Design a binder for this molecule. Sequence first.
Ligand SMILES: CCCCCCCCCCCCCC(=O)O
Ligand SMILES: CCCCCCCCCCCCCC(=O)O
Ligand SMILES: CCCCCCCCCCCCCC(=O)O
Ligand SMILES: CCCCCCCCCCCCCC(=O)O
Lengths: 278, 278, 240, 240, 240, 52, 52, 193, 242
Amino acid sequence: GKMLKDAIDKQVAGALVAGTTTSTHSVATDSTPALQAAETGATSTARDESMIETRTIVPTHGIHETSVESFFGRSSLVGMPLLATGTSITHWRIDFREFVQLRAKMSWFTYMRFDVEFTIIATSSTGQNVTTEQHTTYQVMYVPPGAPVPSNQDSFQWQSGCNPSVFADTDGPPAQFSVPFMSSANAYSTVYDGYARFMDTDPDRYGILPSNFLGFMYFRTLEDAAHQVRFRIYAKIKHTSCWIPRAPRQAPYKKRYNLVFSGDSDRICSNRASLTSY
Amino acid sequence: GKMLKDAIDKQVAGALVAGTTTSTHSVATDSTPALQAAETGATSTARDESMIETRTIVPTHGIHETSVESFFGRSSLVGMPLLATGTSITHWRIDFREFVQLRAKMSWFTYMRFDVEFTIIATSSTGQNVTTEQHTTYQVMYVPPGAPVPSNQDSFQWQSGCNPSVFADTDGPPAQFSVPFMSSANAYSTVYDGYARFMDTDPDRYGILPSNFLGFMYFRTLEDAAHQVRFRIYAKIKHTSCWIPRAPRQAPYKKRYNLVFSGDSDRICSNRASLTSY
Amino acid sequence: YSDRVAQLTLGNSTITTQEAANICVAYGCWPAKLSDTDATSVDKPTEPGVSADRFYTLRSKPWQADSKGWYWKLPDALNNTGMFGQNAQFHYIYRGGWAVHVQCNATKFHQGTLLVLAIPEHQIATQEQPAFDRTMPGSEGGTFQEPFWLEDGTSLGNSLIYPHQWINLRTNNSATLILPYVNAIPMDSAIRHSNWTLAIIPVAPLKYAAETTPLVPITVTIAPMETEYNGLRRAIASNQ
Amino acid sequence: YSDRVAQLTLGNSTITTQEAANICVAYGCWPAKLSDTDATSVDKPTEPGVSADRFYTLRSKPWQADSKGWYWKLPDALNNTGMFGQNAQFHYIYRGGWAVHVQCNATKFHQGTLLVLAIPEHQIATQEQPAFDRTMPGSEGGTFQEPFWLEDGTSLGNSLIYPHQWINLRTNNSATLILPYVNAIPMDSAIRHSNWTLAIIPVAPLKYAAETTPLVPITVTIAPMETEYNGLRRAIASNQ
Amino acid sequence: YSDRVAQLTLGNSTITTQEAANICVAYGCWPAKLSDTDATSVDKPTEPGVSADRFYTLRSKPWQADSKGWYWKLPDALNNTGMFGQNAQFHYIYRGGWAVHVQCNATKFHQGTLLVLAIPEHQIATQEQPAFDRTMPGSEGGTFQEPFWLEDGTSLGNSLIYPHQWINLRTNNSATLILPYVNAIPMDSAIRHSNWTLAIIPVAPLKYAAETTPLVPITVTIAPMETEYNGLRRAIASNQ
Amino acid sequence: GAQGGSTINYNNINYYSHAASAAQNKQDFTQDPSKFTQPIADVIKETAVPLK
Amino acid sequence: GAQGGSTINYNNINYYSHAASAAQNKQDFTQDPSKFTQPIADVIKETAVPLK
Amino acid sequence: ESILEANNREGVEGVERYVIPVSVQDALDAQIYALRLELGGSGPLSSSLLGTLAKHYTQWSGSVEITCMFTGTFMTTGKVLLAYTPPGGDMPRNREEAMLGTHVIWDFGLQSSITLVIPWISASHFRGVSNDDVLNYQYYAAGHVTIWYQTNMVIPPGFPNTAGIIMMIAAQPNFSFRIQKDREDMTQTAILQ
Amino acid sequence: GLPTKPGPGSYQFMTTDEDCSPCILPDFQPTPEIFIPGKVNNLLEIAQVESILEANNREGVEGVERYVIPVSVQDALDAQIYALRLELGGSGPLSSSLLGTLAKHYTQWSGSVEITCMFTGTFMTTGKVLLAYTPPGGDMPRNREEAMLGTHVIWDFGLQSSITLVIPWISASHFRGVSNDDVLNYQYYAAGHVTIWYQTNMVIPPGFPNTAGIIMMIAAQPNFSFRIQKDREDMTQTAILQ
Ligand SMILES: CCCCCCCCCCCCCC(=O)O
Ligand SMILES: CCCCCCCCCCCCCC(=O)O
Ligand SMILES: CCCCCCCCCCCCCC(=O)O
Ligand SMILES: CCCCCCCCCCCCCC(=O)O
């Protein structure tokens, strides 16, 4: 049926890399492809065929593993809240900045528009952190800014009449759910050269764009936990638009909410004793 | 096939918000859009374009998250009966008034016609309420008004020849089932300015419309429970018709079966010291 | 050309006002008779016509400095009045709309504002569940004690969602509301259930250009509209 | 025929250079006004035209032996200058592009190379979160302390991904960049957010054919382009 | 149908009045932009649009028993206000018309009449040539000392040749005048020359139905209309 | 719907017999705000004076 | 695709209502490298001298 | 439209919180009212119909209108300036500063009421409803509404020297909400019995 | 119910799964997409952009100076300016460039690379330079006579400030390994050598700077690609960021 045709999108990865045309020797004063001028800011236009004698090469290699979708389109850890047994409650602030691998991958772009698939793995363990048996339901509640936060395991906030929740078992399959692009802005921002507030220039609000922050995930067990639970929160970025590539992060990350780095030794690649030998 | 076409309904959320037409300055005695009269009971008709000079704005925002279906169309807690080990039996009276979030959401309307998806999460725990292991079947029996109630775990009422029952495991996936609009009336009523009975004006039967009450859910374990079981009963309202919007509840709820409130301090929003500063 | 001048003729009765605002027609729905597709009761209804579809005037109320407001249940307030009252007493079930007219004149030397609410299914409470003398107060009506909470734990400020007009003394001396039947069933008992509440609440207090405060009454005039009755038996006056 | 000779005329102002390289147009995108499909703010924008879309010259900088580099936030650097500055002060939100022209002449007896970066959303840090005097330095601009890390934990070597030119003294004395508006929203506040940073970093140091080092200034000239402003209120100068 | 009710919308600003008389359009000439045939200055004008073509409210004046009158020079009175003021400061020459709205309400228990003159090229004198604080009084305006002679050796009685309205308290509470640009040249400096004077002169004194005289302010609201500016340089605020 | 903008386009497929089993309805239904905002016998056009 | 060479050919079938539920997009989209490599007003053909 | 709980001064209880005082002034250009434009928080807009709906949502967009009704005697006159100031700074301090913004000027007369349309003026397509501090949702500051005497309130001898404005608010047709969220002030400590 | 047989892999979570999954906010309607300049659809658009080699990686050189290879007036003929092992992996100068940092995220590479050099001496400073690419099999070329036997360009300093040496894809296989993993003998994928030599000399007028610089720049050609994503070696953390 055509109605089911609406739920199917045929999508194709068949873009190839550029090929090579055979070329011959050139002795002239007409064509000088090797002479360049980096001052313009343009990258060199010279190609293989104009610099040496080439054979013909039919293109066969795909480019799809470096499409922005493929590069971001896998799951990565973004949150690891620990539910202790004293209160049986925990939360994770929602952003991709606690764990460095996804953050550094995002640092190649300025603005990014995407959806998210979240995946939550819960693991129970003892005080000495050895795996242990515990079968219990847990509740993950999305708490958006301005909604009252639960303060206990039995708080009546966990009613969840308006906050969305997911209920799953600690020893069941992983909870998984998708999320549309939720920013009030038309993209997310990986970096922000401004202040979070008018009438304020506190350093702690520099580089803080609050339209990236959609709130909190809160976690309880539905009864009081017998053992601590660790939730691992994975995000896969999908349906991805990217704008304005950047110099990628090179210094290690130090803080969650700013770009501070050490910068004690100004170098990235390793040293050698002489430029004319390895 | 066309027969399977009967089981598919293509349904679309593409209603947009109103746009903006550009306007220019107006110097006249003809058109006075800013002059109003609130005495009529009509809301102001003045629009942006007639009050200031506007640009053109193409509408892009949807309205679907405030459709009545979307606003009610999620699950909320409505019942939390506890099955103790002494009798291994409990029940929940069926109405959406024990827990305040769903009740307050319903208080925006007078009459509401809907279906229900119920979801039941069972959790076992110790006397000190710490999660514990217990694998057992439980039985939820719909007991409508006039059907004899079970008095024990082994009562022969649990035969369930005519009452519908659901059997599920305490440590299995949650039981879930749907329900059509069951009122003898043509809608449910969120508020009732009348008496439950003729020839009676007892205050305890004021505001009681018994056509909202479809009876009881009764709960046993199929054997005698070793640990207490807590059932959490969630309802999602769906296929929703709503009539006659109301002033929504503002004072906290106090009782399950009437609108009594404290009303000690007559205000809702917070105070300030002066109307001409914040 | 002038929505400040109105005339309302129902039956043998006619109202006029030279300072109206407009006429509020609740939910844009003029009262209408019950169609065969929604009806359930199989007996042929009695439709009394002009004997009941006419304006009735209740006793007036003084607007005092301290007044919190007044309220009337419908049909409750008219259940002992005229041929409406008799048709409502002699039948098990009733249906119909209302034409409500609130009168209050004062001077160009006065100020003050009344809010005139028609509230459907106005179930009331306070710190306690109310007694019968407040839920069904009769022709004399009741008074608010929590006008800020609209007697129901909601707020007066948000009650403009209900059909309403104002009486702002600088502008108008009268409010008119046309109310359709509202219920979750086709017909319902007149003595057991009140479909509408007429509520008149002072918002801006009544002030005079002197300190001597003459009598300024409020007067309610209500006409039933498009009435039907089913279930004829003996006459029963109240749910007690 | 000659991309070494350029003339840039905006408003009442005209720049010339006899040693340009070319003109960099960032992301191949000439500045453009906001279309009705992407716009959200409903008020009619003010478009000041030539009163603001014109070249402004900042104070010059001496290129010294030890210089690490200089930077300016935009619109920050021009927020107190001319009718651009006034339109940016009097409106809540602003949008527009830039025409940037960096001048530095020296001799055929000199050597040295400047890198001229236009960096969008150039949020900066060092071993510490920066204060306001560095995040929004004004017309005088700021100076780099970690030019190798591009003040942001990235690397200067990879900043050629950003729109850029060089000033290599053997080749050219000027760099020209045309910058479109870049943001994740349609308009944004001029005092709270800097959309672009103009960064001028020495890569090859400045050397003279003698040991006596005459004064070689660097001079920045910036023209706003295709500007709009919405949200008219009083004039507000800074986010402090 | 009603020239007693008016609404004036310019920019982000809207005026209303329920007691207007009509609108005076001086010499039947709506403000208009300068045509290429009459223009002399060759540079492309800045036209700020809504950023300047909007109503500005000056500080109010008390109408006292002894009041002789008040006056404001234009553009003088608005030269330090808003984006009009800034565009007038930053350009050598300016042209445009005005929308003037004078407000004064009192009671049906009051009497008194204001004359509201828009006087073009209103050069003033008394027994002495006036100082700058009277020729260009700014936003606060000046006061008459010879209201009978219209500060200029003519007569108030003959000033009805100028565009005018009355505020007669028994009739209206507001006067509206639309003024075209008037000059002997196409454009002229805003700080050196005042093209119009707004003059408000009491003719019948202000009388109250008691001897206790409450505060009755007069309030002026002025919108520039169809403005152009040429000759962009630094901002210059006054001719001193 | 593999995407138009703010258009969610859904094929609700009910697997059970009773219509009540079906998932929630995603249609946008008609909005008549004027039964609540303009509930008056005589229409008052925006440019007119309301009273009289 | 039961295989052409470097052509992955996929029918993304979304079972849920919201487009955000769909799996990741496998299309190759247009590449315009020259907005970053040749971001200059005057094109410089490979065989020409760049300056002048 | 619904009524703003606008007279939220400490000590005002009940129905009186719905009437902003307006008096005969003895000084020029005085301020009547000041209000931070916010759908969230706990100020006067939060308890209205629009504000209570906003309690259930996280984000908002669109134009809002405020309709004011004067309640003085027939013989009482006055002119009022209603101003909307876009964000970036503080509340306007005097009528000279407030008039620089979007504003309407209200003449008391037969038509009892006025509308100030607060138009959607915004860097982004949506704002955050809440003012969540830890999350810096003050980023979404939406400006100021202030009310001023344009001339004065004037009365005949011996009339009430104080009258009222009833403020009313509603959304325009270009308005919407996103992201359902729990209502802050609808709580319970126990199951209802 | 339809009879089924869940098989192996049931209930597993694979990080590269391509599956639809229920949306937790199925009624949400996002903000429109607006035009933004510089949209990127494929990271090989970035790899084709030139970036500066951290080429002067001698022990003791810090900061911006690591970006300028010294070039001097020579007192001897045919001297060497620079030497560089052609490697997208490891930690040498190519590893910190745009192409090198992208290669850190990938396991395999193919295609031609180009190196653009810009001279920074005075207008009056002259010179000719030989840039050589030696295919693998042996060591770095020891003298200019040996290096010239390979692919090479000869650069004349002049008005056009810059030169390109295109390092063409010359390879037994369609792809090479990015890394030099020793236990796995990925030195199998050795990709050759780049060396720079004085073709004549740097010559200056009296009293000019006798030292100038080359800024080396690198980028991928349009025939280039990467395979197999892999974790970046030098982007680590010992603790959760707070
Ligand atoms: C739990 C359902 C709603 C949660 C919304 C999650 C959306 C996350 C997007 C994060 C984008 C910003 C990333 C960052 O700031 O580093
Ligand atoms: C268990 C199967 C039959 C149960 C029927 C449940 C229907 C519940 C509808 C409740 C509507 C009234 C809500 C209320 O009174 O507050
Ligand atoms: C077992 C029979 C398979 C039929 C289900 C096909 C997929 C469900 C249709 C979903 C339609 C809406 C999806 C969308 O386009 O957003
Ligand atoms: C339950 C309905 C069954 C429909 C699923 C049919 C198989 C999925 C289509 C996969 C299309 C791409 C596969 C391929 O050719 O590589």
